[PDB]
């Protein structure tokens, strides 16, 4: 239904605290450059570029390493551990700190940090520092931007009518089914020179795939306008990738897709092929389906949050879930979504912690109840 929640709070991570420093800095790296980068040992997250990762660090060397890595650069290597969880990391992502905070209060160090992923790398070596710190010597993978499929076969006399007037307002009659039908007939007119039809080349068109993905992205938490979902296909693909509830082995394969075109095709592939999200270690219960998936934040249906003990959870927000029982009573402590209280949810068969049930606690709040299901206990299906 309607959502007057002001979905910016989940992205703000206000539960992490108040007096948080807000580094405006940025940094990059040359393509296929061998870099030596520090590693966080306890985070098991598979970070996708453009994703916000909040972390709470307790261990002394970790406090020290974040403290000394704040000044010289701000990047650390979140390795995407394979199914073999201990070591055996072949690829990963670089994350740069954009918010850092230190409180000696209560007599414990605790470093509260918010980072965001920038690049992807392959790890060629993994050395160990003097104090239980992993240094990954890595090579940056390339962002291979692919030219248009008619840039080679193209009549230069027709290459002058290849710009198109403009977008036809926003979702009107004879403005979605008609404008795209004339866009496909004018951008792929040289497809008659090749051995394939226009509708085949539309399947590999960045604009068409982005529009087709946005058609489904609107069903989850109808979008205000194209302010989100950047026009650049690389950024759009990385943003959509962070929202798919697929498991870890599929996420690794998606993160290895070099081109944006193949990444969009794979995301659009697992957007209608998937039918049901089911219990992972239990494998029998039908928890939810796609139809009840909705986004409560600008980041999308799924985002990364952190419990007071430092663990990072990818919580997918759904309207309705079944085969789950609640343990305990609602509490508003450290709540990821401000104004809601959580109750621990476990599956009916194997009593495995699957997520939480959030309920409204303040006055005049539109979604009276929803469910946040952790991704580590979900296995998408047929």
């Amino acid at each position: 239904n309607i959502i007057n929640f002001d979905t910016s709070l989940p992205t703000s991570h206000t539960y992490l605290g108040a007096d948080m420093e807000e580094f405006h800095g940025r940094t990059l790296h040359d393509d296929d450059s061998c870099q030596v980068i520090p590693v966080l040992p306890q985070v098991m997250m598979i970070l996708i570029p453009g994703q916000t990762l909040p972390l709470q660090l307790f261990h002394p060397q970790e406090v020290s390493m974040v403290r000394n890595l704040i000044q010289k650069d701000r990047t650390f290597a979140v390795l995407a551990y394979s199914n073999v969880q201990e070591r055996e990391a072949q690829f990963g992502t670089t994350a740069e700190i954009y918010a850092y905070r230190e409180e000696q209060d209560f007599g414990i160090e605790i470093v509260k940090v918010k980072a965001i992923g920038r690049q992807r790398f392959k790890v060629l070596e993994l050395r160990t520092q003097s104090d239980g710190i992993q240094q990954a010597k890595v090579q940056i993978l390339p962002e291979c931007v692919l030219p248009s499929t008619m840039s080679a076969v193209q009549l230069e006399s027709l290459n002058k009518c290849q710009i198109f007037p403009s977008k036809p307002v926003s979702r009107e009659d004879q403005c979605s089914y008609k404008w795209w039908q004339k866009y496909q007939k004018r951008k792929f007119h040289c497809a008659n020179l090749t051995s394939w039809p226009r509708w085949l080349y539309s399947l590999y068109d960045a604009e068409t795939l982005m529009d087709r993905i946005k058609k489904q992205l609107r069903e989850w938490d109808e979008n205000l306008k194209d302010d989100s979902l950047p026009s650049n296909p690389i950024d759009f693909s990385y943003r959509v990738a962070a929202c798919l509830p697929i498991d870890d082995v599929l996420r690794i394969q998606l993160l290895k897709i070099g081109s944006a075109i193949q990444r969009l095709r794979c995301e659009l592939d697992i957007m209608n092929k998937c039918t049901s999200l089911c219990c992972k270690q239990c494998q029998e219960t039908e928890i939810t389906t796609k139809n009840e998936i909705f986004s409560l934040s600008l980041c999308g249906p799924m985002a990364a949050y952190v419990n007071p003990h430092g663990y990072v959870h990818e919580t997918l927000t759904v309207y309705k879930a079944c085969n789950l029982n609640l343990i305990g009573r609602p509490s508003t402590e450290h709540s990821w979504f401000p104004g809601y209280a959580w109750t621990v949810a476990q599956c009916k068969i194997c009593a495995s912690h699957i997520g939480w049930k959030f309920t409204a606690t303040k006055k005049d709040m539109s979604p009276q109840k929803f469910w946040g299901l952790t991704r580590s206990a979900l296995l998408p299906t047929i």
Binding site: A18, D105, F106, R329
Partner: protein, 298 residues
Amino acid sequence: MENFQKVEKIGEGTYGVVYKARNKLTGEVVALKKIRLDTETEGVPSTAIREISLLKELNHPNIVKLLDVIHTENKLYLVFEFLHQDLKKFMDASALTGIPLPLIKSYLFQLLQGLAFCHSHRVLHRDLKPQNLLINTEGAIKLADFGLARAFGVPVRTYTHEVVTLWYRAPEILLGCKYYSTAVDIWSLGCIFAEMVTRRALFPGDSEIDQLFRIFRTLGTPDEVVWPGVTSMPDYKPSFPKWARQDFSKVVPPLDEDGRSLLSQMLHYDPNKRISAKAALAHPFFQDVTKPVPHLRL
């Protein structure tokens, strides 16, 4: 605010965050509730203004004392008095052998005095749950977290509909009654009294209809004979299943006759004939009241 030194996080109430701090001047332990006004678009939240305004007018041995209020830029601090625990953690720590009947007597007797003090001051707590009843090692239980409180007028008018936690929500509030009054708090105390004896929640429902059906199953389906006007209540439907007044001898075993009568009065369906706090303090159950000292490891 440079005099207090934080020691540990306690928890979060209806709003803000509560810490434990020791005053460096007199060396006493207090609690500090913190509000971040910079995030609050509507300045100081309504709950904050309400609780601060009511808490400086209520001074009772069984209501948590508001020692001092300050404002340090973009932060609001309320200093409270320190209580060592809450009722819930004490009940959980005593889920095997349990709270003695004299201790339950003293706890309910002391809650009723604070509730009667609030009701004499035309104040509706509306948040009587075991998290908000704080106990100490001296054997005193006190009311806390007045954020959801409201000073009801004379006459009353319509206030906020869905109030109180679901497990402690009165049936008239569930049925969408137009006007509610003091009786709701009494109901909560009953729901807590039976909780102190049976050791689990009396009505553990995860939805409105559930809660209502569980209340009916325990106490029977109301009619116009016991509760005038149920058939005319906005949320009452004729399809409600007919259950018949499960005997209190099985619902709440370990307590005797006068306790059973008092609890049945505390769980009466109609607000008009539901027992008032003062007329509950006159019950024979409070004839041999004492003040035992709980031993509360952890």
